[PDB]
Write a protein that binds this DNA or RNA. Structure first.
Length: 51
DNA sequence: GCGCGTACGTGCGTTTAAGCGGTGCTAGAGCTGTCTACGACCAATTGAGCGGCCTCGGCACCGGGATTCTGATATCGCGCGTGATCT
């Protein structure tokens, strides 16, 4: 699978989250797992609200 | 506004443990050196996401109907008071 969400088994965009973390002036560098973790958390909260 | 009653406040006595000074021990926070692997950066490219258009059906509108339901009165039942009868 190409998309990083598919690798992480998520419906939210890991690539977009990584890009925002980088172009958000949050830190000099952004780990590889931070976008995955944040996408998973956002997906969980979205599902929790939508249920 | 009035009246009650009781529950905090003020004060004195007793008790507890906070506080201060002192010494000891070591746990971990900080610093230093070294090294590796993770991420930024770059290039290529292709595919996921977005804009737009179309179809359709979920829901907003309107009309008619069922359903509470809120308030009063009144009827009926129950309770209290007064009158009549019996003991």
């Amino acid at each position: 699978a190409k998309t990083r969400s598919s690798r992480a088994g998520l419906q939210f965009p890991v690539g977009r989250v990584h890009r925002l973390l980088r172009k958000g002036n949050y830190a000099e560098r952004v780990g590889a797992g931070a976008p995955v973790y944040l996408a998973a958390v956002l997906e969980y909260l979205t599902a929790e609200i939508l249920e």
